[PDB]
């Protein structure tokens, strides 16, 4: 939603996500173990050449 | 009570209401008339205080259901938070109303048996150019910089995680004029932040619809402004008018908020009336009771 | 005035209209100015 | 001073060591400032006197119901503790409503039960104390096997 | 929201099922309206903690003394 | 005005008397309806 | 006036300022008396 | 009183009805186990044909 273009260049640290965007009283927590894995950055002029 | 009016024989629908106050006067030189002040039909919304409970339910509603008790036709644009309780204590139903819209950045516009809710109409087309030398008859228009902020943050207590919850709110998208931004504006105090905080159990998405409408209503009133002309039979509220000739940093588009059309001894003219007040609606008039009812 | 409820009614039909509005752009600043910290 | 409308949530800092011998407790507001320590309130209780009374007293971290004196914010007053999701009840609310009592942090009980006219003290290592109108006679039963 | 002064009188009408496991309990209040079955409301009690305190719970048609945080109804 | 304490004091004896009685009716107007829904 | 916030501000600069003067003090009295017991 | 014309077309689900108009104390539930039977639509031009 317009970041950083340099976020998808280090894995997410594992218990950063824990919370809803829109919360809800059924749900009663929320746990990201581990880290996230697949991303990568679009290119820069350097690495096109 | 209708009056229409217009140029030339061809008249329009102007007002509808009824016959509220009749009075009668005679003054120092002999001269002596008979007045008369009408009002639309919300006027029977003013007239008493109410109690009731709302469970499971949205704003808009509470407000159907009220508006609908009156006879009155309703046309509520839907809220997206739902409430485990709503409670209307000892309290009348224009009051009631107006709160409830106001916690979700929506107005309320009232004619012809009819009673609208909705978010102000800010992405529509101009519908005429106001033009200083050439169109207008007065004109008045003004900035101020201390109601402007950077951010707006809502605070509460949860119980059932025992911490505080927070929201924040976002940039609103509102009509271009000037080549000031609020957020220009909002540096000369320079407060990092307007901090609004409650205990009582809020959730998240109420949080962030009162953040959201603080800053919507420090936006919408950045500049405030009048201008007179002459008789303009199809002036309407709630719609954009582009402002032009007064230099750069007041030309552009414009929200129209009010009207006023007055006709004596043959004349006609209209004044138009641009932006919104900056004050909430509970921080202007008395809607609470006194102490042990006042005896 | 910047509101359009502030103006002064107009009731008469055979003619000083603006001195009546100037004397109440006046008070009404006298007024305001008297609420501010 | 500006001040204050309505009732507050509190949590608890400290039990001693007031500066006053005044019986007072350290407790802090979410709302005002969540990192401060707060200030020393007083306690309302079931009953109190001249070295009489019903002494119990929350533990730190323990959350309570606030009060204010004349709508002052220095005069605060504890009007009781509360239960939540976080903080279970003892018992679990029914709609015949038959058990009452005291339970403590160690698990000692005191309870009286509605249903069958019975009242009981017991200790979690197994010494229990009887009264019983289903058995019509009075027991003592201790962990070793006595009775 | 249009807020109350002082204290008020409530009336118990249900003392299981709270929708959240909260420990709440259902209260009207007959000045507002005595037809509706009310809201959920705590308990303030004289002792409480995790798995502690003093369990006692009044029975439906009892008169309780009712305050509210920050004014709010 | 239909009260009596909302009427001008009169302190002069020699001689536009109509004229600050007209531009006040017109401000207790202005401010009064200013305070209704 | 017995204050100094409650003088009207003078914006003209080419020339009846002794009538916008004695129209705010009638003004001011009337209403200050209105709260009074 | 002014209903979607489409309603009659389908029956109502089990568990939908559990309130009063005007609600009153003395009544403590209300359930409804079933669904709805017996409901017809008004006719269409293409039907009519």
Same mark, same amino acid.
Request: hydrophobic share 40%; aromatic share 8%; charged share 20%.
């Given at each position: 939603a317009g970041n950083d273009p340099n976020h998808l260049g280090s894995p997410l640290a594992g218990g950063t996500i824990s919370k809803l965007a829109v919360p809800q009283p059924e749900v009663k927590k929320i746990a990201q173990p581990y880290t996230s894995f697949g991303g990568r950055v679009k290119e820069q002029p350097e690495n096109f050449y | /009570?209708?009056? &229409?009016?217009? =140029?030339?024989? !061809?008249?329009?629908?102007?007002?509808?209401?009824? $016959? /509220?106050?009749?009075?009668?006067?005679?003054?120092?030189?002999?001269?002596?008339?008979?007045?008369?002040?009408?009002?639309?039909? *919300?006027?029977?919304?003013?007239?008493?205080?109410? @109690?009731? =409970?709302?469970?499971?339910?949205?704003?808009? #509603?509470?407000? &159907?259901?009220?508006?609908?008790?009156? !006879?009155?036709?309703?046309? %509520?644009?839907?809220?997206?938070?739902?409430?485990?309780? $709503? /409670?209307?204590?000892?309290?009348?139903?224009? #009051?009631?109303?107006?709160?409830?819209?106001?916690? @979700?950045?929506? $107005? %309320? %516009?009232?004619?012809?048996?009819? $009673?609208?809710?909705?978010?102000? @109409?800010? !992405?529509? *087309?101009?519908?005429?150019?106001?033009? =200083?030398?050439?169109?207008?008859?007065?004109?008045?228009? &003004?900035?101020?910089?201390?109601?402007?902020?950077?951010?707006?943050?809502?605070? !509460?207590?949860?119980?059932?995680?025992?911490?505080?919850?927070?929201?924040?709110a976002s940039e609103p998208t509102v009509n271009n004029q000037g080549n000031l931004s609020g957020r220009q504006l909002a540096q000369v105090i320079d407060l990092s932040a307007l901090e609004l905080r409650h205990s009582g159990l809020v959730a998240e998405p109420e949080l962030k619809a009162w953040a959201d409408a603080q800053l919507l209503k420090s936006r919408l009133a950045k500049i405030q402004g009048r201008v007179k002309t002459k008789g303009y039979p199809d002036a309407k509220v709630d719609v954009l008018i582009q402002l032009a000739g007064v230099g750069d940093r007041f030309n552009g588009l414009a929200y129209v908020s009010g009207i006023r059309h007055e006709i004596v001894g043959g004349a006609w003219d209209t004044h138009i009336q641009m932006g919104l007040p900056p004050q909430w609606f509970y921080q202007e008039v008395d809607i609470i009771d006194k102490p042990a009812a006042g005896l | 005035p910047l509101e359009i409820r502030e103006l002064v009614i107009k009731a008469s039909v055979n003619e000083q209209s603006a001195i009546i509005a100037a004397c109440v752009e006046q008070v009404l600043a006298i007024l305001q100015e008297k609420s501010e910290r | 001073l500006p001040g204050v409308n309505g009732l507050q949530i509190g949590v608890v800092v400290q039990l001693q060591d007031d500066p006053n011998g005044e019986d007072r407790i350290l407790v802090k507001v979410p709302i005002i400032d969540a990192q401060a320590e707060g200030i020393w309130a007083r306690i309302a209780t079931l009953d109190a006197g001249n070295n009489r009374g019903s002494f119990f007293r929350p533990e730190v971290g323990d959350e309570v119901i606030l009060g204010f004196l004349n709508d002052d914010p220095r005069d605060p007053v504890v009007l009781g503790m509360l239960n939540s999701s976080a903080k279970p009840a003892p018992l679990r609310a029914t709609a015949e409503n038959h058990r009452k009592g005291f339970f403590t942090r160690s698990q000692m009980q005191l309870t009286f039960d509605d249903d069958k006219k019975i009242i009981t003290l017991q200790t979690p290592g197994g010494n229990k104390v009887t009264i019983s109108d289903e058995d019509k006679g009075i027991t003592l039963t201790d962990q070793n096997g006595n009775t």
């Open positions: - | /009570v209708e009056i &229409a009016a217009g =140029y030339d024989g !061809s008249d329009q629908k102007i007002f509808q209401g009824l $016959i /509220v106050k009749h009075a009668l006067k005679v003054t120092a030189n002999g001269d002596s008339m008979l007045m008369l002040d009408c009002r639309g039909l *919300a006027t029977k919304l003013t007239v008493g205080r109410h @109690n009731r =409970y709302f469970v499971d339910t949205k704003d808009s #509603d509470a407000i &159907a259901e009220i508006i609908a008790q009156h !006879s009155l036709s309703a046309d %509520v644009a839907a809220t997206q938070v739902q409430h485990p309780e $709503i /409670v209307q204590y000892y309290a009348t139903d224009w #009051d009631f109303i107006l709160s409830r819209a106001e916690m @979700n950045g929506q $107005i %309320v %516009v009232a004619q012809d048996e009819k $009673i609208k809710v909705k978010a102000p @109409n800010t !992405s529509g *087309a101009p519908q005429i150019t106001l033009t =200083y030398g050439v169109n207008l008859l007065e004109l008045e228009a &003004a900035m101020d910089a201390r109601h402007q902020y950077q951010a707006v943050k809502a605070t !509460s207590w949860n119980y059932a995680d025992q911490a505080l919850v927070e929201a924040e | - | -």
